[PDB]
Amino acid sequence: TYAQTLQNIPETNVTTLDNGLRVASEESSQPTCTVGVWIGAGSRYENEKNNGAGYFVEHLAFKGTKKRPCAAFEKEVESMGAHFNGYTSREQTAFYIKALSKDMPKVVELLADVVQNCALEESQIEKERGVILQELKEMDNDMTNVTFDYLHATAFQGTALARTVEGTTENIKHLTRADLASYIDTHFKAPRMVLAAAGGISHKELVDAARQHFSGVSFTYKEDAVPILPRCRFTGSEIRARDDALPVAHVALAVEGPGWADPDNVVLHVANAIIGRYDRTFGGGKHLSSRLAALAVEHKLCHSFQTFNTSYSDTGLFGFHFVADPLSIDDMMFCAQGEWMRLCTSTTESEVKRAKNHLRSAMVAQLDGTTPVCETIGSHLLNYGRRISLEEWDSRISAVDARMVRDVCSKYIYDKCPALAAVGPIEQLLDYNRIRSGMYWI
Amino acid sequence: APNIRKSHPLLKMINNSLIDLPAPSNISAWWNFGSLLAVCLMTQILTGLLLAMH
Amino acid sequence: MAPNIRKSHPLLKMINNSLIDLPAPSNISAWWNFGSLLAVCLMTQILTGLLLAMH
Amino acid sequence: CPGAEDLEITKLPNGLIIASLENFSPASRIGVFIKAGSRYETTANLGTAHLLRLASPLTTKGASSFRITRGIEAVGGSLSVYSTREKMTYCVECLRDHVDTVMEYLLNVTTAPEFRPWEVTDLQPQLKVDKAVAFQSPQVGVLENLHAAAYKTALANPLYCPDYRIGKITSEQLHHFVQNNFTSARMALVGIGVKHSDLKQVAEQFLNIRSGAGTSSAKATYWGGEIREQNGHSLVHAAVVTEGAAVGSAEANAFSVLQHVLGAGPLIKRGSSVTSKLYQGVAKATTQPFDASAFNVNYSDSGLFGFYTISQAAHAGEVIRAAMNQLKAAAQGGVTEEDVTKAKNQLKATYLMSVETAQGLLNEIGSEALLSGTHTAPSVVAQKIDSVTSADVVNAAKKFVSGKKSMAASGDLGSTPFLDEL
Amino acid sequence: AEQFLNIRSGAGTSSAKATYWGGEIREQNGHSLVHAAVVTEGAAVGSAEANAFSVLQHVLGAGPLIKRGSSVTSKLYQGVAKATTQPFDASAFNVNYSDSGLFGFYTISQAAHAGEVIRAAMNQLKAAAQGGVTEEDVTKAKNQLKATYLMSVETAQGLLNEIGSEALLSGTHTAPSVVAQKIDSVTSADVVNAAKKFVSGKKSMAASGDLGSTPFLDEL
Amino acid sequence: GRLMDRIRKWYYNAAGFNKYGLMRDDTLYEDDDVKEALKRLPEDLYNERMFRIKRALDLSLKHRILPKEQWVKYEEDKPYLEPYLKEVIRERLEREAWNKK
Amino acid sequence: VHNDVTVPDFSAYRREDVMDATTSSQTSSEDRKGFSYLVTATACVATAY
Amino acid sequence: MLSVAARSXXXXXXXXXXXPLLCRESMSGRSARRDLVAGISLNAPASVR
Amino acid sequence: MLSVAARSXXXXXXXXXXXXXXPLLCRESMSGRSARRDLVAGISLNAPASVR
Numbered sequence A: 001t002y003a004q005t006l007q008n009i010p011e012t013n014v015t016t017l018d019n020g021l022r023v024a025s026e027e028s029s030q031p032t033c034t035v036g037v038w039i040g041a042g043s044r045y046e047n048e049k050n051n052g053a054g055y056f057v058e059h060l061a062f063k064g065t066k067k068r069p070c071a072a073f074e075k076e077v078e079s080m081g082a083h084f085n086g087y088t089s090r091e092q093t094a095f096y097i098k099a100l101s102k103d104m105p106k107v108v109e110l111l112a113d114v115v116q117n118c119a120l121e122e123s124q125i126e127k128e129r130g131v132i133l134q135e136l137k138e139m140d141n142d143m144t145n146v147t148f149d150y151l152h153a154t155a156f157q158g159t160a161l162a163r164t165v166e167g168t169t170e171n172i173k174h175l176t177r178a179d180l181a182s183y184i185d186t187h188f189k190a191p192r193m194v195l196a197a198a199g200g201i202s203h204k205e206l207v208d209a210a211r212q213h214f215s216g217v218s219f220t221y222k223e224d225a226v227p228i229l230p231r232c233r234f235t236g237s238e239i240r241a242r243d244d245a246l247p248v249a250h251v252a253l254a255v256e257g258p259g260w261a262d263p264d265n266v267v268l269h270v271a272n273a274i275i276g277r278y279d280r281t282f283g284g285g286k287h288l289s290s291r292l293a294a295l296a297v298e299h300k301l302c303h304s305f306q307t308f309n310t311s312y313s314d315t316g317l318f319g320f321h322f323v324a325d326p327l328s329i330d331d332m333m334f335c336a337q338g339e340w341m342r343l344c345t346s347t348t349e350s351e352v353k354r355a356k357n358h359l360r361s362a363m364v365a366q367l368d369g370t371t372p373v374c375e376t377i378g379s380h381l382l383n384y385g386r387r388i389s390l391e392e393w394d395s396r397i398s399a400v401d402a403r404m405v406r407d408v409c410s411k412y413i414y415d416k417c418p419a420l421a422a423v424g425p426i427e428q429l430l431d432y433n434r435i436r437s438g439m440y441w442i
Numbered sequence B: 001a002p003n004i005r006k007s008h009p010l011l012k013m014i015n016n017s018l019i020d021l022p023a024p025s026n027i028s029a030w031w032n033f034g035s036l037l038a039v040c041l042m043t044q045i046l047t048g049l050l051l052a053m054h
Numbered sequence C: 001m002a003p004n005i006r007k008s009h010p011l012l013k014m015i016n017n018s019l020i021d022l023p024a025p026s027n028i029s030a031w032w033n034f035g036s037l038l039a040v041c042l043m044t045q046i047l048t049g050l051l052l053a054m055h
Numbered sequence D: 001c002p003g004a005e006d007l008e009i010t011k012l013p014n015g016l017i018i019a020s021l022e023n024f025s026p027a028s029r030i031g032v033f034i035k036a037g038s039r040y041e042t043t044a045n046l047g048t049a050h051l052l053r054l055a056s057p058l059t060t061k062g063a064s065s066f067r068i069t070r071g072i073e074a075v076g077g078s079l080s081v082y083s084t085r086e087k088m089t090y091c092v093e094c095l096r097d098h099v100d101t102v103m104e105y106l107l108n109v110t111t112a113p114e115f116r117p118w119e120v121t122d123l124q125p126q127l128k129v130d131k132a133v134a135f136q137s138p139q140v141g142v143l144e145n146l147h148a149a150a151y152k153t154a155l156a157n158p159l160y161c162p163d164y165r166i167g168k169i170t171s172e173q174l175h176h177f178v179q180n181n182f183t184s185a186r187m188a189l190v191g192i193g194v195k196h197s198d199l200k201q202v203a204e205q206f207l208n209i210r211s212g213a214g215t216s217s218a219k220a221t222y223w224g225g226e227i228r229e230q231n232g233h234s235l236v237h238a239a240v241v242t243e244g245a246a247v248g249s250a251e252a253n254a255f256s257v258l259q260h261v262l263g264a265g266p267l268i269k270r271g272s273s274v275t276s277k278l279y280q281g282v283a284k285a286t287t288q289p290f291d292a293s294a295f296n297v298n299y300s301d302s303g304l305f306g307f308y309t310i311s312q313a314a315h316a317g318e319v320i321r322a323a324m325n326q327l328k329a330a331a332q333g334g335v336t337e338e339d340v341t342k343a344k345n346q347l348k349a350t351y352l353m354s355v356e357t358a359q360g361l362l363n364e365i366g367s368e369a370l371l372s373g374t375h376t377a378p379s380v381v382a383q384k385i386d387s388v389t390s391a392d393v394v395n396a397a398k399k400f401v402s403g404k405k406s407m408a409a410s411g412d413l414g415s416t417p418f419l420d421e422l
Numbered sequence E: 001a002e003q004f005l006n007i008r009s010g011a012g013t014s015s016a017k018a019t020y021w022g023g024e025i026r027e028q029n030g031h032s033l034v035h036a037a038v039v040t041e042g043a044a045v046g047s048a049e050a051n052a053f054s055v056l057q058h059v060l061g062a063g064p065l066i067k068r069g070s071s072v073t074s075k076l077y078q079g080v081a082k083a084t085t086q087p088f089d090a091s092a093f094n095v096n097y098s099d100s101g102l103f104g105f106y107t108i109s110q111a112a113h114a115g116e117v118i119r120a121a122m123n124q125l126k127a128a129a130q131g132g133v134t135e136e137d138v139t140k141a142k143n144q145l146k147a148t149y150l151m152s153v154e155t156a157q158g159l160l161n162e163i164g165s166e167a168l169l170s171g172t173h174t175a176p177s178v179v180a181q182k183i184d185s186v187t188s189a190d191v192v193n194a195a196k197k198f199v200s201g202k203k204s205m206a207a208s209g210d211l212g213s214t215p216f217l218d219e220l
Numbered sequence F: 001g002r003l004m005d006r007i008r009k010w011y012y013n014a015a016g017f018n019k020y021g022l023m024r025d026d027t028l029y030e031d032d033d034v035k036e037a038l039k040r041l042p043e044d045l046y047n048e049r050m051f052r053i054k055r056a057l058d059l060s061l062k063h064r065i066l067p068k069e070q071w072v073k074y075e076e077d078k079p080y081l082e083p084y085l086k087e088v089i090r091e092r093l094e095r096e097a098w099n100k101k
Numbered sequence G: 001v002h003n004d005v006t007v008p009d010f011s012a013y014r015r016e017d018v019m020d021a022t023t024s025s026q027t028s029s030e031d032r033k034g035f036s037y038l039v040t041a042t043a044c045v046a047t048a049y
Numbered sequence H: 001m002l003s004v005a006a007r008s009x010x011x012x013x014x015x016x017x018x019x020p021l022l023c024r025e026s027m028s029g030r031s032a033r034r035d036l037v038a039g040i041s042l043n044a045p046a047s048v049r
Numbered sequence I: 001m002l003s004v005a006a007r008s009x010x011x012x013x014x015x016x017x018x019x020x021x022x023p024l025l026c027r028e029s030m031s032g033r034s035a036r037r038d039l040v041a042g043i044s045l046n047a048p049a050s051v052r
């Protein structure tokens, strides 16, 4: 039964090393597993001149350490059938490895060798320079991303969050061996990191290995200080990048979210579950339970749309994004804002009952495999300062009711000045003022 | 039609000439007289009827 | 543009799309003749009324 | 509280198999694996299998097109249909409490479709869209033409309904296709996260169309063709294969290993695979961006093996020739006893990880419970894999160099070579 | 010409000599009528070997002469008719290009009787590559060709197209008696050998329609 | 007994649409359910209905009717649309009920 | 690339309360709106009279 | 490994019309692992391997 | 006979559908339709499109 299975889930053991680093894990019967380090560092931590370092770094983090050059490092990882991957966002970076539970210890050593001894060979840096520049031109052709960057760029204009994770063209062309080193030294530090592991591994054996390769301890009190970042100011505004030569338009609209800590985030996610998402290959078609999806199908409003509750430490973005033909942008936006107002004013107990079930299934799905369970642990500790089980989440979710959703949505959406990003043949969508008025009266 | 402002044979008219009607972003105050002329006209008619009744 | 100035002209298009090319059921009887009579009647009442109002 | 269960796996008189597990996961996942695909089509009913895939949400005798969607969404469940060239899988997912609810629809969709003419008619234009998105990846366009050039029948059939047949498929073709292929002896009802006694009660006590093996697929016949698609793309995709091995074939494990020995897909983000002879071999020949891998497919009565490349139009020649030498050089003892050991684990690891996903697991427990009749031990698979000799591998490499090849290209081919120039 | 025409002399871009491939392209499109062509590299323009195929062409059947009639002088047609029973058509295909040529046959038939029609069209090519050419068939064809060529020049378009094609690829106008003289100077052997060149050479094929019963180049 | 049957056949004849060659179903006002029902008709039934209607409209304009022989007979009136229409309504009610609770 | 694009500086036009790039603009929201809506509500009252 | 894959809530959709890779990085892992699968969901995007 | 044809005011046009694209039933309405030789293509500023 559901209720019980949630309980039987093996607890997450957490222990901190006296040097500031935390070690957590969820042990399963699995023969395979995943372990990696989740760092509290990204583009929000960068400045005007070093924007992109965290990314330029992410590229070299695999070209070998000093303890072992490129060919060696790679060969050593490949030849043991382990997968090495990672990423870098705005407030979070992570490098994790997928391998057989056996290699668990050798893995840790490698993780540690990367986060601490990245070689940063200079001949490599002049190569990644071209590689990155290319990835910028390739990603520049992904409207969905060009659009969320523009959303951020304007929503948080004049602040850290307004920057792209990949950085600027100028920075990539001029970043120095120094800057990269400086970035790693300044940011990749024990108290700001978490060693997470999921699969068939012993917490004990895990923490042991940590102490062994995650040594370097701090003397001063500042080395154990986790800096609190300067708050980013939200701005109701819009950026419209117009190009009629593009096939379809992209629109993203959003209001400021609460930030990880806030319990309202639960409700908001339930809300998003009511509006849901949609794309032209959804077989449900005209029968989908999402009113917006239905209209979308009935009136051919868009190629796709999605709601999002992008959380950050102290802020966030709660909105939606849709792709649609040049001549249906207006109606789509109209019906979309409509559904938002419906949220603040008339949500039913029937809609929520379903939204909760969709959300429960969604959270469980985020724990399908070791890599995703590891990602959850890495982020939970880093963002909530601990792990929140499915048993707890579910409790929170069960507490949400129509009444609640209305009050929470009214709180963050009703009569607010949104941030708007529009890219492509956007002539039919127009005037901030008109969009603004859409923010009130069901 | 999703919004009853585009489909309705009458609200479509009020809409397509006073609400969604595309206007140049830079017309000056010298473009304000058309509406005044209109309002004036409805006004003359109303006061005229009131007088014609006596 | 449109070939015949009955389809394009903002006014002749109106006289046309309601009294000349307007699609009507092939079998409406004489009981469908009253709408036009009502109209003509109205124009007539107004004309004779003005003529009387002037005296 | 709960612990370790055991993978039961009954079979009824009509030949319907029932595999079950129970990892006390908070969510259950049930499927209906079926021996049926585009392989059982004929020039007469092409695409019908594709449309049958998209028709899963249509009205059934027990539930309406409406209730199927609103009903499954109501319990936060899901419903999908994955299918290869010879197998179709209808699976649903939901929380443990709603398995029963979600089950009704799975039953109805796979055994009691109605294929109402008008529903079918309104649906067809969707094949046009669904195909258009899939074909965005050039990867899919060449594999369609590959199978085409490689065979003369069954497997030669496209996975996505051909254009000329869009809107010409009938409710009759759908019905007959479902009657002659969705027969109990060709179906299996797998299901992770439920007591085996219940999943069993559902099957027997409910399923209809049955008993038998209806239509039989006309054994695949190798052709060894060469289809080339000049389309202007700056990036040329190319695949060159030879008849490889069938499923369960003793020769299977060999290629799987020869695969990893040559390089079967990157393991380090943005890294230059070293354990990849093929990649390393190519890199030495070309200088611009590219990719190259070992291609391996195992079908019921046949298989395909070779390599797949991607490269700038001009450096297409050097890349494919280079990819070749690397196959010949291996067919000539060029396989160290160690390369075989790396690959061996590299494979057991890949296989192993690929089963953390409820989807991957069910897909494993199912594929066997249908093509076999029971579940192999994860130690047997590993035991069978390392029992592969350095010779097994080298010979597989020879079978490739000796066998008749079939090729499929795409992009600006102005510098791409013809199968007879290799 | 003199007083006007510019664009300087020369020959600018040169065509990269044609290279034979011998491929097999098939287009499954549902049509009830299958079209198919099977050829081999043949004679080049003004080639010596040319006139041979032209005659082997008419010996096999190169397009009907009697409205709705069943060509008898057509071995290929007659050969097909004996194999199939439903509607169809079959002819000798011949193309002469600057540095290469194509030769073979072209068929049209109901999808199901596609097999019998093409195999039958083949035997008729083999049976000819085996002395199956009477000294008379060569004589019929010979005139059948001089006639065709001759009639094809009554049209101002046909004439200008003749006078032009030579004045460009050659440099002068052949005498209509030379052409006729060059055509009958074709031996019963020249013809039979041309037939062999086809049976021996590597073939390339192209189909279209519902090919569910159409054979592959390697099944001939 | 046969009371309902006598009444029905009586009314049927009193109605008189059969004099135009129309089938009972050809006379249904096209509300939304009927609009949908018609879209589900097989091509042949749809075209037959179309001609019957265009035929009646031409008679109506002419102020004539069909020769007694050609009148649709009570027991030969094919209720071709009723099966579809009843289903369209069946589905609509389901959706309606489902969207309430 | 879009990465080289940034929103110009609107200091010359910003209201005071949201002039500081490091202060939550939400705290002065109800203030900035209450004022503008007060002006509107007043125009309504005047017009109603 | 009779898995057609092991040899060979969420999900993101897309859109096209009817009727970029520039480095060894954004291309590696795109060379047909094995057979081609095709999926369709009544609530989630279409996928292909 | 170096004619590309002799080896392989008037004129009637036609029309089809685009976007995607868009009868012979006896040996009579098919004979003479088997590619005589190469394929020519014509275009006139004053007449129909030709093809052989």
Ligand code: HEM
Pocket (backbone or CB within 6 Å): B041, B044, B045, B046, B047, B048, B049, B050, B051, B052, B053
């Ligand atoms: C285009 C709109 C109109 C214009 C320009 C207009 C103008 C005038 C003018 C110039 C006068 C003389 C005012 C004076 O010096 O005493 C007048 C008087 C009058 N108008 Fe109008 N008028 C208009 C419409 C009407 C209408 C619609 C009516 C009737 C329903 C009307 C009824 C009268 C009456 C009763 C008077 C006589 C009493 C008086 O002199 O104030 N007018 N109008």
Ligand code: HEM
Pocket (backbone or CB within 6 Å): C042, C045, C046, C047, C048, C049, C050, C051, C052, C053, C054
């Ligand atoms: C819908 C159109 C109209 C109707 C139904 C109508 C009807 C009438 C009626 C029933 C009377 C009394 C007739 C009698 O003497 O028994 C009348 C008188 C009159 N109407 Fe109208 N009328 C109409 C329009 C007009 C208009 C447009 C005017 C002015 C421009 C007008 C001016 C008059 C005048 C001056 C009289 C008084 C002289 C008389 O009694 O004949 N009428 N009207």
